[PDB]
Amino acid sequence: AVLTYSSFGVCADGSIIAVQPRNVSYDSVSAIVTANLSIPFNWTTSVQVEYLQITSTPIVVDCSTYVCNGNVRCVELLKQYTSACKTIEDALRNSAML
């Protein structure tokens, strides 16, 4: 199957088939007992890849320019919304600094 979701998968020609869990051999705790023990004897090197996101591009917005587009009369009306611009700008700036 090339595309899968839950128990369903589709192959290259589009047929839908049931997907099965990957085969894995679980490691076992060797018992301290008089018996016949199997011990690893030969080894191979395998390389595995993992990707983890560590950052996100910070973005800051000037509240006065975005809503009023630089209109002088508009910025005077914006001052009535005392807590609007301050809350938005503080939330974005602090996240970028941290």
Partner: protein, 49 residues
């Protein structure tokens, strides 16, 4: 910051005659006041969400 944003949203008119519910019922008959109060109900529920 979260509480100040929620309390300040009570001053909004939400395109009604006034933000005070009592002021609407002091100015209009119930058939017309109810339609204007519904604006405050929907707007304030959005602030809670």
């Amino acid at each position: 910051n979260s509480l100040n944003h929620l309390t300040s949203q009570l001053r909004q008119n939400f395109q009604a005659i006034s933000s005070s519910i009592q002021a609407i019922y002091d100015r209009l008959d119930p058939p017309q006041a109810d339609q204007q109060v519904d604006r405050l109900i929907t707007g304030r529920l959005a602030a809670l969400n």
